[PDB]
């Protein structure tokens, strides 16, 4: 459509395109503010590179390819709850 751009583009659309809403969307953090805190601590990573600013709109591919940074305490306690630690990958 063209009405989709003339009407549907919102501050809410770009705000859910923002990163911590996507983290809270993929349930990286339980809350969006804890997602922001994880962003500040750099316990995440966005494809090739990690990130530190919440003020980030993520391209769809990097949304598919965003996760925690390696050897992070948060992913380690993920693998500890799942009881699947692999210290070979310093997981």
């Amino acid at each position: 459509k063209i009405s989709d751009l003339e009407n549907k583009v919102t501050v809410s659309a770009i705000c859910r395109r923002r990163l911590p809403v996507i983290m809270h969307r993929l349930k990286m953090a339980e809350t969006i503010q804890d997602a922001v805190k994880f962003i500040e601590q750099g316990h995440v990573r966005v494809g090739p590179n990690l990130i530190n600013d919440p003020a980030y709109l993520v391209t769809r591919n990097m949304e598919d390819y965003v996760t925690w940074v390696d050897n992070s305490k948060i992913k380690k306690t993920l693998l500890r709850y799942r009881n699947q630690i692999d210290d070979f990958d310093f997981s």
């Binding site: 966005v46 590179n49 990130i51 003020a55 980030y56 709109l57 993520v58 391209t59």
Partner: peptide
Amino acid sequence: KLDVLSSVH
């Protein structure tokens, strides 16, 4: 502007 908002670099 979009490159600013979506750029890491």
